[PDB]
Design an enzyme around this catalytic site. Structure first.
Site, mmCIF file in Angstrom:
data_model
loop_
_atom_site.group_PDB
_atom_site.id
_atom_site.type_symbol
_atom_site.label_atom_id
_atom_site.label_comp_id
_atom_site.label_asym_id
_atom_site.label_seq_id
_atom_site.Cartn_x
_atom_site.Cartn_y
_atom_site.Cartn_z
ATOM 1 N N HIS D 158 0.825 -1.205 0.000
ATOM 2 C CA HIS D 158 0.000 0.000 0.000
ATOM 3 C C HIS D 158 0.860 1.256 0.000
ATOM 4 O O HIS D 158 0.576 2.214 -0.731
ATOM 5 C CB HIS D 158 -0.937 -0.002 1.206
ATOM 6 N N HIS D 201 1.238 -3.370 10.061
ATOM 7 C CA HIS D 201 2.646 -3.494 9.682
ATOM 8 C C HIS D 201 3.503 -2.816 10.703
ATOM 9 O O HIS D 201 3.036 -2.035 11.410
ATOM 10 C CB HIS D 201 2.862 -2.770 8.380
ATOM 11 N N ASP D 205 8.979 -1.554 8.319
ATOM 12 C CA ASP D 205 8.511 -1.967 6.999
ATOM 13 C C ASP D 205 8.047 -0.767 6.187
ATOM 14 O O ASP D 205 8.448 -0.585 5.030
ATOM 15 C CB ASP D 205 7.378 -2.981 7.137
HETATM 16 C C1 LIG Z 1 -0.200 0.179 -12.930
HETATM 17 C C2 LIG Z 1 -1.535 -0.078 -12.236
HETATM 18 C C3 LIG Z 1 -1.581 0.524 -10.833
HETATM 19 C C4 LIG Z 1 -2.977 0.443 -10.215
HETATM 20 C C5 LIG Z 1 -2.953 0.553 -8.691
HETATM 21 C C6 LIG Z 1 -1.983 -0.431 -8.037
HETATM 22 C C7 LIG Z 1 -2.373 -1.887 -8.279
HETATM 23 C C8 LIG Z 1 -1.502 -2.859 -7.490
HETATM 24 C C9 LIG Z 1 -2.298 -4.071 -7.010
HETATM 25 C C10 LIG Z 1 -1.411 -5.273 -6.690
HETATM 26 C C11 LIG Z 1 -2.123 -6.596 -6.968
HETATM 27 C C12 LIG Z 1 -1.862 -7.654 -5.897
HETATM 28 C C13 LIG Z 1 -0.382 -7.853 -5.585
HETATM 29 C C14 LIG Z 1 -0.109 -7.336 -4.175
HETATM 30 C C15 LIG Z 1 -0.862 -7.747 -3.177
HETATM 31 C C16 LIG Z 1 -0.601 -7.234 -1.765
HETATM 32 O O1 LIG Z 1 0.587 -7.797 -1.283
HETATM 33 C C17 LIG Z 1 -0.467 -5.712 -1.782
HETATM 34 C C18 LIG Z 1 -0.247 -5.200 -0.361
HETATM 35 O O2 LIG Z 1 -0.517 -6.235 0.542
HETATM 36 N N1 LIG Z 1 -1.670 -5.109 -2.329
HETATM 37 C C19 LIG Z 1 -1.627 -3.747 -2.832
HETATM 38 O O3 LIG Z 1 -0.614 -3.136 -2.797
HETATM 39 C C20 LIG Z 1 -2.880 -3.098 -3.413
HETATM 40 C C21 LIG Z 1 -2.866 -1.582 -3.239
HETATM 41 C C22 LIG Z 1 -4.266 -0.990 -3.100
HETATM 42 C C23 LIG Z 1 -4.230 0.528 -2.949
HETATM 43 C C24 LIG Z 1 -4.383 1.243 -4.289
HETATM 44 C C25 LIG Z 1 -5.813 1.712 -4.546
HETATM 45 C C26 LIG Z 1 -6.033 2.080 -6.010
HETATM 46 C C27 LIG Z 1 -6.679 0.936 -6.786
HETATM 47 C C28 LIG Z 1 -7.240 1.383 -8.133
HETATM 48 C C29 LIG Z 1 -8.123 0.308 -8.760
HETATM 49 C C30 LIG Z 1 -9.593 0.723 -8.775
HETATM 50 C C31 LIG Z 1 -10.539 -0.470 -8.876
HETATM 51 C C32 LIG Z 1 -11.748 -0.309 -7.956
HETATM 52 C C33 LIG Z 1 -12.977 -1.057 -8.468
HETATM 53 C C34 LIG Z 1 -14.071 -1.155 -7.408
#
Ligand SMILES: CCCCCCCCCCCCC/C=C/[C@@H](O)[C@H](CO)NC(=O)CCCCCCCCCCCCCCC
Ligand SMILES: CCCCCCCCCCCCC/C=C/[C@@H](O)[C@H](CO)NC(=O)CCCCCCCCCCCCCCC
Ligand SMILES: CCCCCCCCCCCCC/C=C/[C@@H](O)[C@H](CO)NC(=O)CCCCCCCCCCCCCCC
Ligand SMILES: CCCCCCCCCCCCC/C=C/[C@@H](O)[C@H](CO)NC(=O)CCCCCCCCCCCCCCC
Ligand SMILES: CCCCCCCCCCCCC/C=C/[C@@H](O)[C@H](CO)NC(=O)CCCCCCCCCCCCCCC
Ligand SMILES: CCCCCCCCCCCCC/C=C/[C@@H](O)[C@H](CO)NC(=O)CCCCCCCCCCCCCCC
EC number: 2.7.8.-
Lengths: 264, 264, 264, 264, 264, 264
Positions: D158, D201, D205
């Site tokens: 995050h 966390h 970290d």
């Molecule tokens: C280049 C694309 C970038 C888009 C945004 C980043 C996407 C990264 C998602 C990683 C996918 C899973 C791999 C990691 C899993 C976890 O170990 C990790 C932390 O524990 N999760 C995140 O970091 C997840 C972070 C969440 C916080 C970000 C919020 C923004 C999300 C935007 C998507 C909108 C969709 C909503 C639909 C309802």
């Protein structure tokens, strides 16, 4: 212009004897890895299986060495560049013997069944190993002055010294005497051949012993003639203390002979 | 100008294949010399005594063999001089493996005890040693396609193949790709780590097999880039049929890539 | 021109001894947070689970540390500008050990189970915590002179000292000595490996200790060579006492060597 | 000249998706190591001991993340060189998540006691670990769409996403809007504080994640602006697929804004 | 040229003392208007309702007061225009505290319930109100030398003193020392957080006292540095006898420092 | 050139109306933190203790408001650039009212005993709170159209509207009509004085309200005349959407009058 350095040859002379003591210490330590090493049967060799073992075959190996070093002693005496010739022999024999320690520490290859009655064994302590090492060091490994009671390990030093002395004799003489050169060559071959006939070292024991000395001899002279120690940062030559000995010498050493004694 | 000679490459490819069959045949002969070679205790070592045996470590060595061969095949197709690269590969593996046959016949050495249940043996006649040779020849010595049922001898060929394919990848790619070169170096080192941890070959059989291929590789291309086969009688090259293969090429082969198909 | 300041170095040497005493006191306050820190099961690591504990591995790290200190001391003795080198080492070890106090107070990460037999504990008062801090202070934290009786916390200090001394040896020696540069690197990697093999720190406690000392050393030297402390107001350098110490030194310190004693 | 390459952004997006899938699989494998990881007593922290757990403090982080993502998408919509901007974010997120996988493999540091009621566990086989990894992958790891049911490991993701989005929003807006910059910074710090205050966390970290993301972003942008990918063989940039992406882009990307829709 | 006048300083110095007693004297008069002021529940707040009371948080404010005054005393000694600096200290502190007396008389606001236990009270006559005023006047309102035993009214004076001594430290030091300035800001903010955390003054008491001193300080120096007292009738300065104090000085006071003792 | 934009006025007019609703929404929440606030005795003041409550003192305070805006409307009706004056009233009343929300959230200061008969209270819900807010929004806070039935908090808006209207009437008239200016000033004091005489706002409630409106009024006009929005990056003026409204206006506005209609 080469400068005779009478103080650098002392450092080179000391260096070879330190390596000699180190090699004697290592062969004692590696000897206790396996207790017996006389129960195994010899590996199938193309040479040790055909010719029968001759007990007196090895006695003539060091005989050729004494003649070879005696001949090399005279040409050293009747050569004006006495510092350079002695310093180029100690700087090479001190390098090969270090490669001897590394190749016998990783693995131990001996002849299983010859000289099986050498006494001693189970040298379990801290201090009594040095007493054995001292005898090895100040015994030259000779069998006439019996110190080397039983056989030795991979990369035999008898071939190293016989081949090393031959190359200095051959090419440090005028290129018009092709009668002494063949005499030195024929003695070297008989000494190597007598090693195999004595059932003391394997066939592969000598082949990689003859190659390493020959390759290291040619690599040293080529770099010495090319004068790459200061010409460029070519490869950072890995010879132990090489540039320190060849910095004051530039070019190829001449072969002018004279008489040292002031009483003709 | 470099003229692609497509008829000399065919002859060279035949030459290397004859060596493998000839090398495989003598493996039966030397194996018949020793009755078992599967009962003795192993000689003392520095690496085979510390780490325990890993049953799956032998397969991982040849898993990396495909990756090096697959990349080399890709490089071979996208190179303008396909007849030049393939001729040197068949002319180097023929020489190094010829030395492997020679060092096996003069001295026999193996690790005493792994794979002691291989059946058959005592093939005393002329008309089934070729049958065993053909099975090993037409199995490429792999363990996945099991032909190498039991132990091997000195100067392991599993390191010669990995190292030779490692140097061709680095040599015959543009001198700016030093990441595939890094990857091709990690594969070679790990392939050497696993062949030792599997208790298949001594610590000295690997080192003298990683050195001969490296030395014979640099020496071959140094003779080529310098172009000493016609400039002067430098050393009367001892490579089998070296003047015949490289007579029609002058200078150094460039590193520009072409595409043979006409369908972009 | 380099003016040797003999009064600023004394201020720099005093600055270190204050920081070392401050760190030795934090290790007592932190240890009183968790009572036991010896009953928990260890975290799943990749290096602490494969290699079993070596009882003598921690006494060897400080052996590699003294050798690097002996080599560095000779460099300081035979260097023309020995004052600046002594002032730069004390200005860098006082900063890294301040970062160790910050990461130890924020979170405490120890190894649960080694030195579980150390007695003492529950020093609840103000009057003997200072006594306990003095025992660690005047023992340099080494394991030979027994002070390190209980466990150690995050951001290992052994790795900081070994890496800082290693980079000073290879930086303030002539750029033609590529055998001492390689020898020092070997001593550095073996010292780090014996910390992990003794189960004294986690695989991440050592990796980030090696990174920070490497990054802070390179940043300090690339910032003083470009005389950025007075060239402009670039970033307001955050190093403790940076402009005060290096304002009299302009440009890069050369590598002139001499002999201070006047008795040849 | 800035040539919009529309066939490399697809490759970058595919690379990022592969990296995310690999990260999910590695997370599942790491969680499979320790069975309980929920009975241990928590390590003594300075922020996790003072501020009590806030049940709703983990949704606000994702609210801030979605707000920042919406702002970044709005910036991407009205930018001339949107392709280059989209090609740079992916090539950095992939590298940072690869670093996260590497630092997660060597050591596992979780928070012992939150999400102790999550069921499932002991997925010992190959066939449903893939299903769990697919769920975590196509659940985005967010707590809103319930996938993050059990605990999380070192190098929080995050913080990486929040810091990267904030830095990209600040970087590619005109250098006169210093109120949106302050709003984004406030959102980033509030998100970090809400991560820390939810007992998800440790402090170290989050600190190392923030430092690594900031340093990598600054280094990548400095390398891109100084045009070091072809200027010389400076250091062989270790960024995955760096020279392949920025070779068509010369100099610094300007800040021209337009409207892609041709229907005013 | 700036001519230091030591006669105006004495007259300006006694200005604050007569005001300080007047400010102390008005405290009892407003205190007599309401008898209890220690029984009603407190008004709703945002900061006094979240954090609990910290008994030792009130002393830490005045601990930071000593450091700011100690540093300022050092500046007042190592300065060359010491007469100029001290006159502005008495000219500004007198005006702000004069408003502080005014704001209590028009409206009285305090914290209902802290320090409820103070004895004495109902001093109805002329001849002991001064005695109580003299006790506070001779005790400086501190709590370590406890004279301010029970509550305080509108426009807290612990914020005026801390902020006024903060802006003189930063302004009257050379504009390259922005680390003491950073320390003087951290020292001030912590003093502002502790007075609020001790439930001694409302959340609006601090803000309207941190703003008035800042505004009255910036206005005074800008009005003086630009030399608007004699350039033109700019705004008919409302400060008490501002023209009389600063008539003899032209321009801005430099930041060079001298040393009064003649014993280096 | 003074370009009149009729589309920016609408945007400015909408902005002030949103703040009007937001302030009403805050008043509902801030009223609910304290249940009663009708039992405390009023704080001892210098004015409320002497002057008795006048029931009709607040009756005519808004009457002056209609007269003041009626005169201002006529000036707005007979001005050449009507847009520029309208955007200088909405962009300034929209900033002060936001400062009213901030000072009510941090603390709540009201008069305990007047408007004690206000009914309703305890609106514990999420949805029906807006109906109370909607009444406040569409009631203009008038006591004639009774919506504001209960007490009021810090930073009274009654003084804000009176003072802002007074200053626009004064300086937007030719500097030869110094007879109407006195009348506008006379009305302001009587309206303000009756607010304090109605026992609805404390003495400190109004003085802080008079200063904020006056200071923000003069600070806006000085920056508008000096044209600091594009001259240099002086201080990053913190007024909301300030540069967006004054970017198309250059210099100071004159005060010429004309007739808008085309039918004289
Ligand atoms: C280049 C694309 C970038 C888009 C945004 C980043 C996407 C990264 C998602 C990683 C996918 C899973 C791999 C990691 C899993 C976890 O170990 C990790 C932390 O524990 N999760 C995140 O970091 C997840 C972070 C969440 C916080 C970000 C919020 C923004 C999300 C935007 C998507 C909108 C969709 C909503 C639909 C309802
Ligand atoms: C400064 C250069 C001097 C070089 C002369 C030879 C020195 C080498 C003597 C032993 C060195 C110690 C380490 C070797 C230990 C043995 O494992 C080794 C291998 O089996 N044995 C020999 O080298 C057996 C030695 C064979 C050498 C015979 C050649 C003639 C040399 C005679 C000079 C020695 C004087 C003694 C005269 C009786
Ligand atoms: C395009 C050029 C490819 C040439 C690759 C080398 C071809 C060598 C063929 C060997 C045939 C038998 C001769 C060797 C007998 C053994 O005494 C020897 C050492 O134990 N084993 C190997 O050499 C076998 C060791 C195998 C480990 C290396 C793996 C790489 C092999 C690549 C060839 C792929 C073909 C596989 C088809 C099943
Ligand atoms: C600027 C001078 C630098 C000199 C060498 C570094 C001295 C630093 C000693 C730290 C003093 C205590 C503060 C740290 C305490 C522990 O939390 C820390 C980590 O566990 N221990 C060490 O760093 C202990 C690591 C020790 C490894 C270094 C070994 C070299 C010591 C040289 C001194 C020789 C004296 C020997 C006399 C018998
Ligand atoms: C060289 C110039 C120094 C001038 C510093 C300011 C002098 C202020 C003396 C106050 C005299 C009584 C008037 C104040 C009454 C209280 O209602 C008021 C707020 O409650 N308390 C303070 O102002 C007390 C403030 C508490 C914070 C401490 C700051 C005082 C440090 C200066 C005094 C050093 C003397 C130390 C001797 C041990
Ligand atoms: C941009 C145009 C602005 C022109 C005038 C707008 C006045 C808006 C004031 C109330 C707006 C709601 C937000 C404030 C709520 C209360 O917390 C606040 C403080 O008590 N009430 C007032 O300020 C109430 C003070 C009212 C005093 C006179 C205001 C002048 C209004 C003239 C309009 C008369 C129309 C009447 C028709 C029936």
């Amino acid at each position: 212009r080469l400068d005779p350095e009478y103080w650098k040859t002392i450092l080179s002379c000391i260096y070879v004897f330190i390596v000699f003591g180190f090699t004697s210490f290592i062969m004692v330590i590696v000897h206790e890895r396996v207790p017996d090493m006389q129960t195994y049967p010899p590996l199938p060799d193309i040479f040790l299986d055909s010719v029968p073992r001759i007990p007196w075959a090895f006695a003539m190996t060091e005989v050729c060495g004494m003649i070879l070093c005696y001949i090399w002693l005279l040409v050293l005496l009747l050569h004006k560049h006495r510092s350079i010739l002695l310093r180029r022999l100690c700087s090479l024999m001190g390098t090969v013997f270090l490669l001897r320690c590394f190749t016998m520490f990783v693995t131990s290859l001996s002849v299983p069944g010859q000289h099986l009655q050498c006494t001693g064994k189970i040298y379990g302590s801290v201090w009594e190993k040095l007493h054995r090492a001292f005898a090895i060091w100040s015994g030259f490994g000779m069998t006439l002055t019996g110190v080397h009671t039983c056989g030795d390990y991979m990369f035999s030093g008898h071939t190293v010294v016989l081949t090393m002395l031959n190359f200095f004799v051959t090419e440090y003489t005028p290129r018009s005497w092709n009668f002494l050169h063949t005499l030195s060559w024929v003695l070297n071959l008989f000494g190597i051949f007598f090693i195999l006939a004595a059932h003391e070292h394997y066939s592969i024991d000598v082949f990689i012993a003859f190659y390493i000395t020959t390759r290291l001899f040619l690599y040293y002279h080529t770099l010495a003639n090319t004068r790459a120690y200061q010409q460029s940062r070519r490869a950072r030559i890995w010879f132990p203390m090489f540039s320190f000995f060849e910095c004051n010498v530039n070019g190829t050493v001449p072969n002018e002979y004279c008489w040292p004694f002031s009483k003709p």
